[PDB]
TrEMBL record, chains A, B, C, D, E, F:
<feature type="binding site">
    <location>
        <position position="17"/>
    </location>
    <ligand>
        <name>Mg(2+)</name>
    </ligand>
</feature>
<feature type="binding site">
    <location>
        <position position="17"/>
    </location>
    <ligand>
        <name>Zn(2+) 1</name>
    </ligand>
</feature>
<feature type="binding site">
    <location>
        <position position="53"/>
    </location>
    <ligand>
        <name>Fe(3+) 1</name>
    </ligand>
</feature>
<keyword id="KW-0479">Metal-binding</keyword>
<feature type="binding site">
    <location>
        <position position="17"/>
    </location>
    <ligand>
        <name>Fe(3+) 1</name>
    </ligand>
</feature>
<feature type="domain" description="Ferritin-like diiron">
    <location>
        <begin position="1"/>
        <end position="145"/>
    </location>
</feature>
<dbReference type="GO" id="GO:0008198">
    <property type="term" value="F:ferrous iron binding"/>
</dbReference>
<dbReference type="GO" id="GO:0006826">
    <property type="term" value="P:iron ion transport"/>
</dbReference>
<dbReference type="GO" id="GO:0008199">
    <property type="term" value="F:ferric iron binding"/>
</dbReference>
<dbReference type="InterPro" id="IPR001519">
    <property type="entry name" value="Ferritin"/>
</dbReference>
<feature type="binding site">
    <location>
        <position position="129"/>
    </location>
    <ligand>
        <name>Fe(3+) 2</name>
    </ligand>
</feature>
<feature type="binding site">
    <location>
        <position position="126"/>
    </location>
    <ligand>
        <name>Fe(3+) 2</name>
    </ligand>
</feature>
<feature type="binding site">
    <location>
        <position position="50"/>
    </location>
    <ligand>
        <name>Fe(3+) 3</name>
    </ligand>
</feature>
<feature type="binding site">
    <location>
        <position position="94"/>
    </location>
    <ligand>
        <name>Zn(2+) 2</name>
    </ligand>
</feature>
<dbReference type="InterPro" id="IPR012347">
    <property type="entry name" value="Ferritin-like"/>
</dbReference>
<feature type="binding site">
    <location>
        <position position="130"/>
    </location>
    <ligand>
        <name>Mg(2+)</name>
    </ligand>
</feature>
<protein>
    <submittedName>
        <fullName>Ferritin, putative</fullName>
    </submittedName>
</protein>
Length: 162, 162, 162, 162, 162, 162
């Protein structure tokens, strides 16, 4: 039932979820390098979260009788201009992930593959949260601007994530 | 104090630990594809293990004052002639990972980087277990030869790993 | 079989550890003098911790069959230009302690005194943390420069240390 | 990959650990014979402890891919002029086991067998304790001299070891 | 009052109990050599159990005021054709150990040494179990023959012993 | 992965399991017709049980992503010479159902279809029980013979089945 075309694409998106993890891990290294252990922590938590996103899709492809094929994970970028620019890139990347999910929804429907549609609804809801979390911190870094105490305050708040 | 040479090698090995995890994840797919869910499980656990291995080094490079550069993760192989060949590939890959850790140990000696030498001793000990665990299962699968009832028994046991 | 050369190098290091403690107690007074009770708390904790490093080495010297000679503890300096300057001194000092530790490690290697070589690996690993904890505060102090509200945020953080 | 000459050496040291136990068990019969039930206890405990030392190495030869050959265990001596002489024998014995372990460490270094080098570090630190425990009791027994009431106070203390 | 002839005879039977331990230890190696870590476990446990047998009798000789002499433990054998042959050697060995204990019993009665007779009744019952446990596994392995799965099923049964 | 071959074979076994049900329901009517309400109840319970056997296969064919086709269920026979003759038909019939299952097992193993092999193992075990149960009552009736209080005794006993 699950079509070979639907598998390939889910396999794409599995790779996109892993590269996001890996992107966030590179950011963990960047925030590490500029003293911000709380931001670093957030990123490490996001890395593991995106890996979990990938695995939940890895397991669904196998369950449905599809075959997971893993592809290369690209070398991510490694520097950003500022914590603000880091999170702005998070936001934009997550909006891109949200696009690619909306398309998998659309493909599922064309193929009348109701199981893959229903499953992707998890990721549709999850992307709403991803974008909003990312936006919310972007807004906070914009008011903070150059104010070093506010920056360190946000960094503590972020160190608390699990 | 940590040299650039040494930071490079460690960043490389971090990439290799992540690759190892990714190979084992591939094998988990292979094993799903021939209905050995226990072998699959064993791999899925070893994938989490190797990622953890990677992170302990990722954190160490940054504590030593160096900077983690992340590199592409190679697309891994996707098929194996049999369960025996896949664990034969496992054992061998592990013997190589060991060789890599031994070369890192020697570099640390050459450079008198006592901190990195001591740190690496954990991997010296871990690679002993890695090899032995893989070899034991290669042996089991040799003893089992062609008997598919015995394969499923070993499969159910491997499904018990957490 | 522990040599005289070794027993004296270890006794001198016992003195260096106790002086490191004492130095950090002098910095505690300095930080009290300028209203930074959290910086003061950090130094106090570090003072107990360094005393604890000396005591582990004290016990070991006798465990090996040696005798601890105690030497004078030098009057430490009592003024620094700034928090940043004081923590730059902590860092350069701990880099020097490391350098002494590594000397002992070499001396023990050179003497085939394996028991002492092994005992000191704990100090090899401890010094990694010691340099990192201090460099992290130096860097935060740099990031902060003259902003006194941020300095006070950081003082509060250090008042948490146990 | 462990060499033959390293396996054989380890297996000789397994034998020596077992002999050590057996020597200390003979000593327990000695002490029973002169009514000193605490010195007896101390030895029975150390006979178990040396067996544990042997089994730890027995397991490691197997976990490296080697195979353990077991050897005759020589008939230990059965008499000593006095409690002081028995514990002197214990001391000179343990200093000799330490020598044996140190030779093992050297061999491992020469062959670049880092895995064995690292495993043996446990026996390097254990021998530090073994020498000091036996030495303290030797020194106590010298302090004590021919006083029989004091000897029995020591005997009672030694009966508390578990 | 226990006699000299009895004390020697119990002293030899200890030796025999320690040898049996050592024999079983040798088999543990042999089963470890051929992949059967569950059989190996059984053998480690029997190795401990026979040491407990020896010590119980070591203590009894003491309790009666005899002196335990310790003799060389003999180098054991180290290969067997198969799991079956090994357990046949176990049973035959244990049947022989029964014979020795039935001889100590008849000696005891001859000397009217009731306290040694009563003491030996524990070993008389224990041997009934020793024989019956060995024979049960011989019987099971014959029925098993060359069937690999069934072999592995029993090796897991044996991994359970404590 | 599950073959067309294996699916049609399972669907056919499903038919066989529903027919078994219906055969047992037809006997419940027989036993009802001759005043044996306990035998009837036994059949009604066995009818629900074989329906459950069916549905577990229906669900399994469908989980593995194959399509259950439903075939006609044959008119079963409706009379028997006696309770004994009736339970002899149950036995023969169950021995036949065992034949079919063992055939489904070998086909699975041919196609190396290990999920299906493992799933059928429940039925192999279940059939061992079916046969033993039927056989046992067959035997209890050979004994009862013409004896009427013992037939009513057996009849109460089968009332009890839930
Ligand atoms: Fe995601
Ligand atoms: Fe995301
Ligand atoms: Fe999320
Ligand atoms: Fe690893
Ligand atoms: Fe590994
Ligand atoms: Fe491991
Ligand atoms: Fe220190
Ligand atoms: Fe320090
Ligand atoms: Fe510290
Ligand atoms: Fe020892
Ligand atoms: Fe010792
Ligand atoms: Fe000890
Ligand atoms: Fe025994
Ligand atoms: Fe026995
Ligand atoms: Fe027993
Ligand atoms: Fe059925
Ligand atoms: Fe049935
Ligand atoms: Fe049933």
């Amino acid at each position: 039932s699950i079509s070979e075309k639907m598998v390939e694409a889910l396999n794409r998106q599995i790779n996109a979820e892993i590269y996001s993890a890996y992107l966030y891990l590179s950011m963990a290294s960047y925030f590490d390098s500029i003293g911000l252990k709380g931001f670093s922590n957030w990123m490490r938590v996001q890395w593991q979260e995106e890996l979990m996103h990938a695995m939940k899709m890895f397991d669904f492809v196998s369950e449905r009788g599809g075959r997971v094929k893993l592809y290369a994970v690209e070398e991510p970028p490694s520097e950003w201009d500022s914590p603000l620019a880091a999170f702005e890139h998070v936001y934009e990347h997550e909006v891109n992930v949200t696009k690619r999910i909306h398309e998998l929804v659309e493909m599922a429907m064309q193929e009348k593959d109701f199981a893959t549609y229903n499953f992707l609804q998890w990721y549709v809801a999850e992307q709403v949260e991803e974008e909003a979390s990312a936006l919310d911190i972007v807004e906070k870094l914009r008011l903070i601007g150059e104010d070093k105490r506010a920056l360190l305050f946000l960094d503590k708040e972020l160190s608390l994530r699990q």
